[PDB]
Every structure is written in C-alpha cells, then in structure tokens.
Amino acid sequence: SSFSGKYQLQSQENFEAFMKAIGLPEELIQKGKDIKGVSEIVQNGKHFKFTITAGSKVIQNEFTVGEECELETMTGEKVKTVVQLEGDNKLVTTFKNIKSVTELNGDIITNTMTLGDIVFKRISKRILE
Amino acid sequence: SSFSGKYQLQSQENFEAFMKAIGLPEELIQKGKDIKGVSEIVQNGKHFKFTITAGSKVIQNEFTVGEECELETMTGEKVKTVVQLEGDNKLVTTFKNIKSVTELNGDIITNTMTLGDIVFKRISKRILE
Ligand SMILES: CCCCCCCCCCCCCCCC(=O)O
C-alpha cells in the first residue's frame, strides 16, 4: 500500500551490462558493481521522494505520479518523463530506450529496467524499523 | 563498543566550505549538499569496512587500525595513511592537511573533519534493524 521505506539491496542482475549500455566508463562500473547500499523512498499519496543509491552514485529524484517530471539518470542526463502508479504497488515509466518497473510485494522491491536485450533487475528488502 | 551498523545522516555543518577547500567540482557540491543518506560500517576487531555515502558519492574503504592503509577520499584521490583507535570510541586519521575523528556515542556517530579553519561535522543515527 505504501512504498515508504529504507531498502537494502539484496541482489542484482546485469548491472555491468546495463551501465555499459548507457555509456558509463568501465573503470566506474567496476568500482560500483559490488556495492549493496540502501535506497530510500518517502511516499505521500501520489508524491514520491527517492534517494537512490546505485553503484558509486546517489541520485535524489522527486515526482508526483501522473505529472511530467525531470528525473536525473545514471548518465547525469535529466530526462523529461511521467511516472505512473499501476494498482497501489507498481511504478512504471519509460525514458530514452529504457522501460522501468518498480514493484513492491510485501517488503521486497523488484526494480526491472529493460534496455534492448538487457534486463537489469534489482531486488531490495525494506529495513524493518 | 562496536561501530558496526547502518547510520542515517541527520545533520551536517560546513559541507560546502569543506568540499570547496578540497576542490570538489561545484556541480557536485550543489547536487550533494542536501542529500542525507545511509553509511555502513562493518567492524571485526581492528578491521573496518566502510561504505560511506557523502553527497552524491558512495565511497568504499577498508582498513585495519594501526596498519598503513590506502584510502579513497572524497575527490577520488587515494591517500596512504594510518587510522588509530583513540580512547576506545574514536577512530582518528590525518591525511594531507585534514584531521578526521569518528566518534561513537551509543546510537550516534559524529564525524569531525578539520581542515585549517573549517570544521566539517556530520551527525548520524543508527538504523534500528
Ligand atoms: C529514471 C529513474 C532513476 C534512474 C536511476 C537508475 C539506477 C537504478 C534505479 C533503481 C532504483 C529503483 C528504486 C528501488 C531501490 C533500489 O533498487 O535501489
């Protein structure tokens, strides 16, 4: 019902292949690929504040679902898009050639980003506090 | 006794002045100054693994107290130094012209980095898992 939480990265698939595909340098990818950090979400109805930690980067994004937003991506580009909420537990958006699905089941968020033939999946678990 | 834990940044003083003094690019200072993320410490006796969230960066360092180590700093530069345990509750290191003190007070960690006339102070709080 609510995405709010601190989420500890448990596992991921295709981090290196996805980061290479969007153009990050290999020296940066290798430094970040084994980090398992904590991302935070604060949901207030349609409003979301994301403090995303991915590899060596922290990205702070804020959006209201249904409204055009500007999202900072892993390349540093800020992309104009709209994030939608499907049901109460799936956030969906597209930007550039990437399809992103953020799904909350119980305490586990599965984030699936698809770029051509690369499916970049992150499994994170809410810290019980 | 143990530093082990995940800690959320609560407040900080003189981030911009300190980051300017070490020459962090202005764009990273502005992007990172308001981010309050999660840092992790794993302590095994004298050995420490740090996953530090500072501004828009995540930095991983490992060291053994009393042994010469090579640490990555906020600019990405690597420094050769030694980290000491002071009075059993403070980790202390000096590198270049910076003195860093990491002090554990129950669930509160305070990190104080002194660079000339600038005292960069971070106060964080243990996440109760
Ligand atoms: C356009 C949105 C932000 C783009 C940043 C891409 C880096 C990976 C995004 C995954 C974060 C999704 C939130 C769940 C928590 C997590 O997996 O850290």
Ligand SMILES: CCCCCCCCCCCCCCCC(=O)O
């Ligand atoms: C030895 C290099 C330090 C890393 C450079 C970034 C400066 C911030 C370091 C503070 C981290 C200390 C651990 C406590 C938690 C925290 O304050 O994030």
